[PDB]
Design an enzyme around this catalytic site. Structure first.
Site, PDB file in Angstrom:
ATOM      1  N   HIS A 155      -3.113   2.629   3.899  1.00 36.23           N
ATOM      2  CA  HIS A 155      -4.483   2.463   4.394  1.00 36.23           C
ATOM      3  C   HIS A 155      -5.390   1.651   3.446  1.00 36.23           C
ATOM      4  CE1 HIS A 155      -6.690   5.575   2.120  1.00 36.23           C
ATOM      5  NE2 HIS A 155      -5.659   6.396   2.304  1.00 36.23           N
ATOM      6  N   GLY A 186     -12.050   7.690  -3.655  1.00 34.54           N
ATOM      7  CA  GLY A 186     -11.412   6.860  -4.674  1.00 34.54           C
ATOM      8  C   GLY A 186     -10.148   7.484  -5.273  1.00 34.54           C
ATOM      9  N   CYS A 236      -7.471   8.467  -3.571  1.00 42.36           N
ATOM     10  CA  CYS A 236      -6.239   8.133  -2.827  1.00 42.36           C
ATOM     11  C   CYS A 236      -5.253   7.359  -3.679  1.00 42.36           C
ATOM     12  CB  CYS A 236      -6.540   7.402  -1.522  1.00 42.36           C
ATOM     13  SG  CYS A 236      -7.618   8.321  -0.399  1.00 42.36           S
TER      14      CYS A 236
END
Ligand code: RVR
Ligand code: RVR
Ligand code: CL
Lengths: 305, 305
Positions: free
Chosen positions: A41, A143, A145
């Site tokens: 993503h 942030g 991820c």
């Protein structure tokens, strides 16, 4: 003596954390050998998240659209491919700090350490368990991820989780390092929810054995139980069923303390009925379920007090 | 979202851990520049521990009596000296992995990360606090002496604790990196005990602010209190007195949540007088006191290193 929620030393993983940027999106990547692994993503905008077509978004990208930063050095991306929900970015430099490693997919109840990171920079380390509902109760901000979960039994790092999302209840979902999600979750902003969670019974039993090893027996009783009667009671308290595999796995702790697994099950049944009556077990007023039988054997003395 | 007992990333400290052996005693050392720091009791036998004269034991030692192992490499000791309860072994090689560092002495209530080590090899990392009675509730087995406690500020490691001993209640005692003990303890086998402990009030308040930030507000009420009335109540429950400095330090968390510090003190008073009534706060049935105001701000902001 003592019993703490203990994480593995994080140094071997810190030396693999990088920052990955695609357009306006920035998150963390894991740099092992000449490949950077990150959530796919990273190629999405906020609008793309409802029904992203990752194959269509990815085909419009070239190698130079991905910016990878390792410390203050920019890595050059020379290839890219998607594997399930992870993006694999081939880079022109092999990580000189790559530890001995493996990718392992874990089962609910298993624990691991999480190295929370922002902008490719590590901020903290904590211990987590994969819940029976396949979520983790982490501590993650925007942030985070791409932050990873791992174990380091011996000198080898076994990577088992990569962070992808936060569900509406504030719990977290992610994938193994092959990009397969744990649980029935998707990397889509569509309405998704954590299923009703349950207590990891085998882990609570392991932690009761840790308490006996460290010198506390107040919670023991003169009774035993059958495995079926234990499960009938346990499921009334939202506890996971205890299987013969779990009984076998608790064998070493049973031998070290001299307390049969079904006798410890009788103590657990009584604790569920009575509560603790103002007492604590290993500094906790709740029954702890994020220590596995293996974690207890690793942290506790081999000599019972 | 989420709130975990989080340790600092341990990599910068892992690269400093070595094994120190003197005769039959093996423990851990901290290798910074060309010096290895370790507990001075490494020179003692079990009998010597009853009433040691450390200068007399040390004068009988030569540089080659100290075996220092860094990974699979033997370091050569070229000098030795004692500073309070710490032995400083000058070695022929400066540690190429020495991070930017400082030696800092902390106060009770302050938290830090512990890198538990055995045979100079890191095994785990956990967070803890220096108790008001100057002990720490750590998790240490035989061979853990010399393991260190630290905080990280930007890129600088501030070393604040070195492990020396376990007290009869299973709690731990140690020194700062200058060899000064925290607490009224001595490095010898004699009758020693942890004093009566108290709860770190400013930390409980910080953790109640963390719960509000994470969406747990059931304990909030319309009431306020004076600082004097709060302290009269807190003294009754073995809680440390709350000072104007503590109120000032909680200012930012008070502004973020819109709850005055004395307003949160009134919630804490009611929690002490009435309990939780079957409820939990951040997954705990006890009032947690091992998160400082700075730890709460840092975890709820994603500060990296
Ligand atoms: O969940 C997501 N991010 C995220 C992860 N960890 C922690 C936190 C956040 C968001 C803020 C709060 C703290 C994103 C964006 N939100 S989303 O619903 O668009 C989404 C959906 C799927 C996937 Cl794979 C990802 C996402
Ligand atoms: O306390 C000590 N070590 C130690 C440290 N951490 C954990 C554990 C131990 C001992 C076994 C149990 C777990 C030693 C030995 N015991 S002692 O009483 O002889 C002692 C006294 C002073 C000093 Cl500085 C040291 C010591
Ligand atoms: Cl597993």
């Amino acid at each position: 003596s003592g019993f703490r929620k203990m994480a593995f030393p994080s140094g071997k993983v810190e030396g693999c954390m990088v920052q990955v940027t695609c357009g306006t999106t920035t998150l963390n990547g894991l740099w092992l050998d000449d490949v950077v692994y990150c959530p796919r993503h990273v190629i999405c905008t906020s609008e793309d998240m409802l029904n992203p077509n990752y194959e269509d978004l990815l085909i419009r990208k070239s190698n130079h659209n991905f910016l990878v930063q390792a410390g203050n050095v920019q890595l050059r991306v020379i290839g890219h491919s998607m594997q399930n929900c992870v993006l694999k970015l081939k880079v022109d430099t092999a990580n000189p700090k790559t530890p001995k490693y493996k990718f392992v997919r874990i089962q609910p109840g298993q624990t691991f350490s999480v190295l929370a990171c922002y902008n490719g920079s590590p901020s903290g380390v904590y211990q987590c368990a994969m819940r029976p509902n396949f979520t983790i109760k982490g501590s993650f901000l925007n942030g985070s991820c791409g932050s990873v979960g791992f174990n380091i039994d011996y000198d080898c790092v076994s990577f088992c989780y990569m962070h992808h999302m936060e569900l509406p209840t504030g719990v977290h979902a992610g994938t193994d390092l092959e990009g397969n999600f744990y649980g029935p979750f998707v990397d889509r902003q569509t309405a998704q929810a954590a299923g009703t969670d349950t207590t990891i019974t085998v882990n609570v039993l392991a932690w009761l054995y840790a308490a006996v090893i460290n010198g506390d027996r107040w919670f023991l009783n003169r009774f035993t139980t059958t495995l079926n009667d234990f499960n009938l009671v346990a499921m009334k308290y939202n506890y996971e069923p205890l299987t013969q595999d779990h009984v076998d796995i608790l064998g070493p702790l049973s031998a070290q303390t001299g307390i049969a697994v079904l006798d410890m099950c009788a103590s657990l049944k009584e604790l569920l009925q009575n509560g603790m009556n103002g007492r604590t077990i290993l500094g906790s007023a709740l029954l702890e379920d994020e220590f596995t039988p293996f974690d207890v054997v690793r942290q506790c003395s081999g000599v019972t007090f």
